[PDB]
């Protein structure tokens, strides 16, 4: 029997290419999915044409609510539903715009940047583990936590408690043989709305061809993450940001 | 006049004695209490009577909700109605128990442990700085958030969020000249909840004198960070742990 | 043509696993040894069977002194004769001892602890660019935050081989080559070591109450020096089974 | 009886403004110098004017060699023969250059850059705990230790050992009651040979103020460290940086 994973808004960008990388490797594949019906039913499609009933969706709003636990529980139900086991969850729903100190209410923001960015990993952890091989869960976090943007805190507080989750459950369910770790983009693949001449700005300053990191870069990373070549590997947090992280003001 | 400091949670243990330190020193404080209303006006009574009319109660629930923000923006009025300023603000309330991974409902364990120990303080760092000289914050952090507790995830979640707002909001708030900075205790005052022998196999790890700190060594820390000799200081998390996140398992 | 290796301390134990692994991968290995001669010359003469040609024995000692330099600029030369090139640098040497605070003279403890866990990677490190999938990968430690007692040059010389790693980043950069970490907590225990004591180090590793095999350590290598880690350079991947995350 | 402190490289620049704090406090000043005689003089001048027998000098070179140990000795020998005690080390001496790697021999870099900044730190810390109340030893690290310059290698090895030393020390020396911490400076004064538009250019990069730091801000925070008020405070490095490390590229 092939093994399963749980891939957390993997309709595109950098989630669709670890679901794509975790399916060439031979996962039966989960693609939640939020607003992206159409691009995840459409990823579905192509790697099901590849392989026949291994990739399904499943829609879920991540925002921290009473019903989260609920919603959480379901993503991993229905891995276990359509392939009857879950061996892996990467955690790479993000939610991410600035809520300047100094549109939406702060109760929104708040439980959109805490919930998709840490309480719903907390949760689909929780579920995951509770439903139980190369068992293991990877996290997407931040190589700049701790050099935050401008105007970012609440989403730089979500990633900060993401590492604290990463380094706990690592902690926890390393006597259930569940690993835990993380994998930490710099600058990867732009936000759809930025300008080139922006785009290129923010490249210039990557010490290692100052240039983003592909989708690929960063699916390399989780792909070595939950291989056999990690058995040993938990609570690690790989950055892979070309060096972004060391550069000094 | 003289400067005002608000203190949360500041009717008992460590933040009482942060407000009885920061009031030696000269501040007028707001003492800040959820149930602990009796503690409180006797502390704002013996603060009182060494100085007249510069101690000052204030009732507000900081678990996570709708009205998080109103009870935040309260917090920091009562300052302002009191005394005509608010110069310091000490993140210091502070909820703490297991939620383990594989009782209170979880959306109560995220309110609290989530709500209290990170939304609320980035509420009151808000609006601290939407109503601004020596201005600071000062946040209690945990000098073991790298070295988590078994079952802990969502306490060590919090702190590592509070870690994140601590190093947006310095520089954040940089420019309006508001220094933002956080004290990380070890042990403290162990669990009443706890026994003795119990007690001591914790404290026997801390290689400095084997023993916790006092709540006012504590305090030590924060009247550092917010005087005049600390005014080039922001970003900064001083440890208080008498070694003892440097002890190895 | 394949590409080429050197291994600083590749006779035995973690430095003989990477060796091994780069010559599974299909690299020519350089194996560099300062006592283990015997241990270096099988290894080559195995991995030659395998493949003719492909591994040679280097001989230098690592401590720090005025001849240092020559040594690893020599340690660099000796890929470039036997196989024309030198693509990968991993720094695996290592002296430990305890050196307290309060019969080796101090100023030969520094010599040792320090110059071949911090000083000859950074001259090799020199000699490895001036020369130029370039990278390096050093060996650093998990624990480098939680020191043992008694272990102040050993931990000085560990962490100075951090700074290494990412000032070596970001100075090379330009130059396309990567330069990344390997951090073990426990891998393979003094043999000397009784094991009612390996027991209670092992006891301490969260993920299977064991110490690392050198074969885990040397997959984190294989993995930073492929084409999957590209984009990977100032990165410090521990292996430590969560050892680091476990508070006294 | 007043209690006696090391200060290494106290001739000038933030040496000089430990050891006139120190001083102010009411400490017996041990001032060392390598090359700064006549600067070191005048301090200790200036010093006994204002208390008689409270200052010496003390030369040596603090490059590593095979005497190195011996040179360490006796700046801590030189404090008992004057004062009879030596309650206080301040490791400030620092060698400061560029080491790229692609008119000194390497040999004399490493010997410098690591010797200055590690090794006789390392070698005056044994000297100090092995000679022997409030002991405590200030390391001067580095804020920028983990975002270092292009060309620093060196200079960045050593203030790394740095960490490690303060660290390590800190565990080592606790059941002896010696207190081992650090003081993270970002930018403080800037080289005497740079030039004024170059010296702009990096000031303008510190969120606090758009400025260095003064000699006196750094000493403040040594001075909290030495204190009764830091009691509790072992491996702990402040960063006093106006926020400098946490500005991204
Ligand atoms: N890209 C970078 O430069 C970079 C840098 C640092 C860290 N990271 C981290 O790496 C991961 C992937 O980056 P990315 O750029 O590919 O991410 P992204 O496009 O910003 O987000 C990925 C997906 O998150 C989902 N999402 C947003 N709000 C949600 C909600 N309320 N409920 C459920 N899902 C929600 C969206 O799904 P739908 O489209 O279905 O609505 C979105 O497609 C993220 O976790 C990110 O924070 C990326
Ligand atoms: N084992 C662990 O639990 C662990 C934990 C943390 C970090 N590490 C690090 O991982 C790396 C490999 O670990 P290991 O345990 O396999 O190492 P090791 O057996 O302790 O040492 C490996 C080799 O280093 C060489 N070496 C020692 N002193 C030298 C000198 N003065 N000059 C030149 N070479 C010298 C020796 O070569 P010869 O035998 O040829 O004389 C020795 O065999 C090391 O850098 C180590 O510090 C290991
Ligand atoms: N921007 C900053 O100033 C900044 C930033 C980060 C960290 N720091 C750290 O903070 C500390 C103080 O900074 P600073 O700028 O005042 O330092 P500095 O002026 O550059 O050097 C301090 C003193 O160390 C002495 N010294 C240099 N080489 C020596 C040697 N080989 N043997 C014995 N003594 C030697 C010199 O003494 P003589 O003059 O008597 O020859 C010098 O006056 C240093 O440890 C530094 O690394 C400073
Ligand atoms: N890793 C990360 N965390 C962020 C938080 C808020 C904003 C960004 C961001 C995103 C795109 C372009 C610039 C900053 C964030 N990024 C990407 C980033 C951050 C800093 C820098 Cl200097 C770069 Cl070139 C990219
Ligand atoms: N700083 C901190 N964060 C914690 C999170 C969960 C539990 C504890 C804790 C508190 C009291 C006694 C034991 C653990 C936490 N503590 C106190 C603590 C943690 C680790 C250790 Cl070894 C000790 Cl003696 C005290
Ligand atoms: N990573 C590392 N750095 C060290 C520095 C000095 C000594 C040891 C060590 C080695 C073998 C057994 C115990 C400590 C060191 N180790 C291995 C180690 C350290 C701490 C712990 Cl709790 C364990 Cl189980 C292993
Ligand atoms: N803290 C520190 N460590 C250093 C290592 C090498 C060079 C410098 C340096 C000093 C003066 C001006 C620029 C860089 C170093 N500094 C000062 C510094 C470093 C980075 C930045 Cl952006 C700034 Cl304004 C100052
Ligand atoms: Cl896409
Ligand atoms: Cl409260």
Chains 1, 2, 4 share one sequence.
Request: hydrophobic residues 45%; charged residues 15%; glycine residues 6%.
């Amino acid at each position: 029997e092939a093994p399963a994973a749980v891939v957390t808004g993997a309709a595109k960008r950098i989630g669709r290419a670890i679901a794509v990388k975790l399916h060439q490797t031979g996962y039966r594949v989960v693609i939640h999915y939020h607003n992206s019906a159409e691009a995840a039913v459409s990823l579905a499609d192509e790697l099901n044409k590849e392989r026949s009933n291994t990739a399904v969706v499943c829609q879920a709003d991540l925002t921290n609510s009473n019903v989260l636990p609920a919603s959480c529980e379901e993503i991993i139900n229905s891995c276990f539903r359509a392939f009857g086991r879950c061996d892996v969850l990467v955690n790479n729903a993000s939610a991410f715009y600035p809520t300047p100190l100094v549109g939406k209410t702060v109760e929104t923001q708040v439980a959109e940047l805490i919930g998709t960015n840490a309480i719903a990993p907390f949760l689909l952890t929780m579920s995951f583990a509770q439903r139980q091989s190369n068992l293991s869960i990877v996290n997407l976090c931040d190589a700049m936590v701790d050099q935050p943007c401008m105007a970012f805190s609440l989403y730089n507080m979500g990633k900060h408690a993401l590492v604290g989750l990463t380094q706990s459950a690592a902690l926890e369910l390393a006597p259930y043989g569940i690993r835990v770790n993380g994998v930490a983009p710099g600058v990867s693949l732009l936000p759809v709305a930025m300008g080139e001449e922006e785009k290129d700005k923010w490249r210039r300053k990557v010490p290692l061809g100052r240039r983003e990191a592909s989708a690929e870069q960063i699916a390399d990373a989780v792909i070595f993450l939950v291989s056999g070549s990690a058995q040993y590997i938990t609570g690690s947090i790989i950055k892979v940001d070309g060096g972004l992280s060391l550069v000094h003001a």
